[PDB]
Amino acid sequence: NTSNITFIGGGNMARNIVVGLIANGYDPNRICVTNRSLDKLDFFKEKCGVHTTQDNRQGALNADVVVLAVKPHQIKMVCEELKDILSETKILVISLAVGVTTPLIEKWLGKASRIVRAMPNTPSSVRAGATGLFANETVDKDQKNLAESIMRAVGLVIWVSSEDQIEKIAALSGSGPAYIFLIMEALQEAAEQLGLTKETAELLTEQTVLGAARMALETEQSVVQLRQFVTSPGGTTEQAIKVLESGNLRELFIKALTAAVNRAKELSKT
């Protein structure tokens, strides 16, 4: 190892990843955060103890990895600002910009630009993010482990062979938390419909969701098999489940993710 990582933009996602790295003992001297405004840089400067600058070029100078963490409308401007610094350099660029495809990023940066596109989600802010990654052709294996490692600082990381699967990631893990929020609400309010106080129902619902997710993660069993541990033949759970299967949830979700992916394609910048 020996990687200088520069984050262009000092926003929420950059902060997520930087704090994740710092917390895992990543050398703070090997990190640079550039931001347009000074306020945000105070945090990175004082608390994180990483390098800060308001000059993207200075910031990117000598970096092995440049992470593009600016809002999507600023992505072309920052690229054009760094095209000369990053030209024929073998430097890895990680794009966090939603919707922005790699070929489009290549147009701005050069043709042999080494690009990884990340699709992280909101739970990144609580160190439980799910990130889908797509790697350019130019990206060498070392850089793929590097990209994966950096994004693992905020949660788990998967790869897709084709960049068109990113929109499917966005629809699943990108928009997924919202789905769970909706679910938790419905479940919460059902519990409250019975004689459970709002506070108890809220807490139990969240712990229940947390626990089922933890179990699924740390266990070999499928979610089907884990469901069996909960269900006794002719038991209470089985009756509640029969009702949930009444609602045709697989199909409900298929339409939901389809709507999401369709929208993602329309919003996709190429």
Binding residues for NADP(+): 8-13, 35-37, 40, 56, 69-72, 98, 229
| Of residues 13 and 22, the one with the C-beta less far from ligand NAP | 13
Q: Is the dihedral of CA 50, 22, 64, 155 positive or negative?
A: negative
Is residue 270 a contact residue for its own copies (CB under 8 A)? no
Is residue 49 a contact residue for Cl ion (CB under 5 A)? no
Site residues (CB under 8 A) for its own copies, limited to 66-105: 71, 98-99
Of 150, 111, 110, 164, nearest to 30 by C-alpha is: 150
| Of residues 3 and 74, the one with the C-beta less far from its own copies | 74
Among 3, 11, 108, 269, binds ligand NAP (CB under 6 A): 11
> Which of its own copies, ligand NAP, Cl ion, none does residue 29 bind to, with CB < 5 to 8 Å depending on kind?
Cl ion
Is residue 214 a contact residue for its own copies (CB under 8 A)? yes
Is residue 155 a contact residue for ligand NAP (CB under 6 A)? no
**Residue 8, SS3?**
strand
In the sheet that holds 92-95, the strands lie side by side as 51-53, 31-34, 5-8, 65-68, 92-95, 114-119, 129-135, 155-159
Q: Which burial class, exposed, middle or buried, applies to 139 when counting CB atoms under 10 A from its CB (0-12, 13-18, 19+)?
A: buried
Q: Which stretch binds Cl ion (CB under 5 A): 5-13, 28-36, 66-74, 213-221?
A: 28-36
Q: Is the dihedral of CA 143, 173, 259, 168 positive or negative?
A: positive
Structure tokens belonging to residue 124: 């990144």
Q: Which stretch binds its own copies (CB under 8 A): 42-50, 76-84, 104-112, 261-269?
A: 261-269
Structure tokens belonging to residue 133: 């990654």
- Minimal distance in Å, beta carbon 240 to ligand NAP? 12
| Contact partners, residue 263, CB within 8 Å, separation at least 6 | none
- Using CB under 6 A, list all residues that contact ligand NAP: 8-14, 34-37, 40, 56, 69-72, 74, 77-78, 96-98, 119-122, 174, 229-230, 232
Interacting residues with Cl ion (CB under 5 A): 29
